[PDB]
Design a protein around this ligand. Structure first.
Ligand SMILES: CCCCCCCC[C@@H]([C@@H](CCCCCCCC(=O)O)SC[C@H](NC(=O)CC[C@H](N)C(=O)O)C(=O)NCC(=O)O)[N+](=O)[O-]
Ligand SMILES: CCCCCCCC[C@@H]([C@@H](CCCCCCCC(=O)O)SC[C@H](NC(=O)CC[C@H](N)C(=O)O)C(=O)NCC(=O)O)[N+](=O)[O-]
Lengths: 217, 217
């Protein structure tokens, strides 16, 4: 069994958890609990942070035998390589590469306003730009069933996560993009994905850690 | 010829420029000049931002025939795929994947304190953590000639950019890590890399855009 180590939140591990479930990967989760305010005790993680053999210790981390991987996108790429979910044509690889980085940027942008204490002042400005960001995703997808082409790749798990987070934040934001709504439906309708969302292992909340102004609970 | 579009600064294009030079890639650069304070006029880019056919318009961008790529890591991966600089074994790919993301995180951390107006208050705290960060790179490299193994990969260009920026910021930071200094020497000693650094095309400064508190000039 692989070990997925991360906080007891959704955060950056959501797509890793979904990709593990979809690939029928045998795994165990090591969950770290963060303390409440004002200290936000990370001692549970910080004590074993340098005792795991990680090259650049960080959460999330995946231990799969001899391989100890950090960086959420690197963990996703590792799992996707085992089950051929990386794209085959050069066009597919370009789409995967762009999206892997683009979704990270969109997740960071949301996370920055959510972790800022002036979240209430920044929120309306973020909401004005949100339709423009979502429009790029709607357009890039187009008539395709999946984001890289006709086959599902790990970037579909990343795009789904960004779309789901924005629908948690602003529920009406996907209403203008029918193909984005259809993509969420198609992704959630996958047999393993559907089973995992009904199970007890499913952890859709909290969206961020206890230190966030939005999504801490 | 491929077209590399980016601001007239070093920024996120430094490793792309170096990788293009090392691979003997035929390319042209489209440089966008940002205006001075307080407006910081990005009209040169904003006018043709939606007229290039880019799926997710951004700087840097690479146009190579039918392929229009955005996201610096995606551009690097595209070029590296053409010249087999992505890693062959699974161990090498894991190293490349970790580093591609890890170097992006280190670049973002330096960029966040350099774009913050309280740069002078944040700088000493960032300098206390810097030895710990550099130690991880020194330990990950070990006795290897390159970061992924014995062969040079595109992540060596990314790591070099991170190390070089930190030595521009605090010059004595690499003195404690002899193998990191040796890596810089070995990377800069490559025939194409050495030739490009002596040429007029070389753009090592400004480190960041005009809006940055540090590295704007
Ligand atoms: C606020 C920072 C910018 C927005 C971040 C958006 C995503 C947030 C993530 C993260 C929360 C970040 C908190 C920032 C500081 C908040 C306090 C303030 O406000 O100063 S969780 C994972 C986080 N690891 C990474 O960030 C390594 C990311 C790497 N590229 C990857 O993808 O693996 C962690 O817990 N590390 C433990 C450790 O270092 O030992 N999450 O989901 O909670
Ligand atoms: C705010 C934290 C600091 C930014 C992170 C540090 C790296 C900086 C980069 C950047 C400068 C940004 C600085 C912002 C500052 C704000 C200030 C304030 O409003 O408060 S490159 C230029 C930038 N490109 C990206 O961001 C593409 C990133 C992508 N993940 C990749 O890897 O392609 C751009 O302009 N693109 C055209 C567009 O606008 O769409 N650089 O090297 O100059």
């Amino acid at each position: 069994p692989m070990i997925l180590g991360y906080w007891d939140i959704r955060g950056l591990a959501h797509a890793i958890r979904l990709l593990l479930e979809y690939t029928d990967s045998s795994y165990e989760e090591k969950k770290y609990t963060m303390g409440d305010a004002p200290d936000y005790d990370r001692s549970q993680w910080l004590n074993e942070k340098f005792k795991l053999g990680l090259d650049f210790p960080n959460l999330p981390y995946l231990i799969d035998g001899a391989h100890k991987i950090t960086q959420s996108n690197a963990i996703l790429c590792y799992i996707a390589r085992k089950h051929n979910l990386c794209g085959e044509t050069e066009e597919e690889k370009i789409r995967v590469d762009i999206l892997e980085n683009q979704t990270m940027d969109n997740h960071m942008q949301l996370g920055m306003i959510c972790y800022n204490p002036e979240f209430e002042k920044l929120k309306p400005k973020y909401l004005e730009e949100l339709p423009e960001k979502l429009k790029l995703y709607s357009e890039f997808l187009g008539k395709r069933p999946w984001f890289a082409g006709n086959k599902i790749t790990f970037v579909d798990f990343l795009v789904y996560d960004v779309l789901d987070l924005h629908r948690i934040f602003e529920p009406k934001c996907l209403d203008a993009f029918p193909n984005l709504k259809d993509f969420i439906s198609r992704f959630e309708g996958l047999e393993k994905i559907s089973a995992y969302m009904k199970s007890s292992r499913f952890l859709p909340r909290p969206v961020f850690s206890k230190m966030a102004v939005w999504g801490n609970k």
